Amino acid sequence: YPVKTDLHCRSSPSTSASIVRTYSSGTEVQIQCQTTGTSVQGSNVWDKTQHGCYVADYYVKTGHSGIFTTKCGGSCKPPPINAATVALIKEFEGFVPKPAPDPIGLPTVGYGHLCKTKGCKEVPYSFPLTQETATKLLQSDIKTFTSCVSNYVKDSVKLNDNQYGALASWAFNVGCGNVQTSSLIKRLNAGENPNTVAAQELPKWKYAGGKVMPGLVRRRNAEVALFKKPSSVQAHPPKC
Ligand SMILES: [K+]
């Protein structure tokens, strides 16, 4: 069932409970079970979703007002990437304020955003982009990659925000399928010291067309330096 608005998914069926994640308008939810809690726009019905958190049923488009399924009788979103990670991706992707005017093939904008159309009008920000809107665009794009990193790395392997951000930057560059089959993920999951794994594995990802690319050597070195940058903030597994 689609949510009718940006809808908070809470740890209990209560507007006072902590927010586990927020579903954007139109996102599909599957209802495990329903319960009663805080009245929202005249309905006290709350739905437990596929993520194990609770949403106000008023904002889920089901065709029902009352409880219609099992009575009851979460999983934190990966965090946004930090400032240092954004700065690294901007260094290596550059900044493009507007799409090339009449492009051959699909253009880029912002910080390495590949457009789906030549006009790129499906991007939800006005052209030209500013540093602010390029960053928001990047935070949206990077969700694919923080999601797959956080999926493939075991939850017993704690990564700080710099480590997580470095992997997100790598993943964005190489794609999730490559992350999944990487020795990097394998060695992290075997319990090897993360900084050692990163330092040894990331520099291997330097080849294009059988040829070592200086730009990739440079990027992997910057990703290694970010990975090893000390932090006491845990990013993986997510906390909420
Ligand atoms: K995981």
Numbering used by the authors: 1 to 73, 79 to 245
From the paper:
Muramidases are N-acetylmuramide glycanhydrolases which cleave the β-1,4-glycosidic bond between N-acetylmuramic acid (NAM) and N-acetylglucosamine (NAG) in the carbohydrate backbone of the bacterial cell-wall peptidoglycan. Here, the identification, characterization and X-ray structure of a novel fungal GH24 muramidase from Trichophaea saccata is first described, in which an SH3-like cell-wall-binding domain (CWBD) was identified by structure comparison in addition to its catalytic domain.
Here, we report the identification of several new fungal GH24s with this CWBD and the structure of the intact T. saccata enzyme, henceforth referred to as TsCWBD-GH24. The linker, G73-SSSGGG-S80, appears to be flexible: its electron density is ill defined and it was not initially obvious how to assign the domains which compose a monomer. This was resolved by inspection of the surface, which strongly suggested a likely choice of connectivity for the domain pairs. While it is possible that the relative positions of the two domains is flexible in solution and that this particular orientation is a result of the crystal packing, we note that the linker is relatively short in this enzyme.
